[PDB]
Design a protein around this ligand. Structure first.
Ligand SMILES: CC1=C(/C=C/C(C)=C/C=C/C(C)=C/C=C/C=C(C)/C=C/C=C(C)/C=C/C2=C(C)C(=O)CCC2(C)C)C(C)(C)CCC1=O
Length: 139
């Protein structure tokens, strides 16, 4: 559908830009099955990593790097993968994961994507995020 043009547009951004956009999408939310327990499990592991390790782990998930953790994430359902990304972002907010650069100004090319997405349907907006995270991890 149209969500394809978005996911591909999103994927055609820098790895550090993609994270930045995903992050702001999360902030704009507060101002086939899913298995939640498994998702928090992976998160717990990531929580043990230091901040650098936690950033690279996210860069790795996008770049499809072959980690021991990238493999765990790859073996998850599409719906639980998204839940896991929410746990990371929530984690950053709760000081338990690498905080976002205060000085990071978002590019205007992603400021557009942010706006276009906000105008999307709730169902679609969900499918967009779900379609974005599934093509990640290893294997
Ligand atoms: C520090 C630093 C940085 C790093 C920045 C970093 C680390 C940025 C990381 C940003 C992160 C972790 C963004 C995550 C966003 C998650 C979203 C929007 C979740 C949507 C979930 C939904 C819609 C729920 C869906 C669903 C779920 C799951 C269910 O399970 C059932 C409900 C429902 C169906 C609705 C930079 C790269 C910027 C610079 C370098 C540098 O130093």
């Amino acid at each position: 559908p149209t969500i394809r043009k978005y996911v591909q547009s999103w994927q055609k951004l820098d790895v550090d830009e993609q994270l930045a956009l995903f992050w702001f999408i999360y902030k704009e939310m507060g101002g086939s099955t899913v298995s939640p327990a498994i998702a928090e499990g992976l998160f717990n592991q990531v929580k043990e990593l230091n901040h650098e390790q936690q950033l690279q782990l996210q860069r790795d998930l996008i770049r499809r790097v072959d980690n021991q953790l990238s493999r765990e994430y790859g073996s998850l359902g599409d719906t639980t993968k998204l839940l896991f990304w929410y746990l990371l972002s929530q984690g950053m907010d709760n000081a338990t994961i690498v905080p976002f650069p205060a000085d990071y100004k978002l590019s205007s090319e992603s400021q557009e994507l942010l706006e276009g997405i906000k105008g999307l349907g709730f169902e679609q907006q969900i499918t967009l995020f779900r379609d974005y995270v599934s093509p990640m991890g290893a294997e």
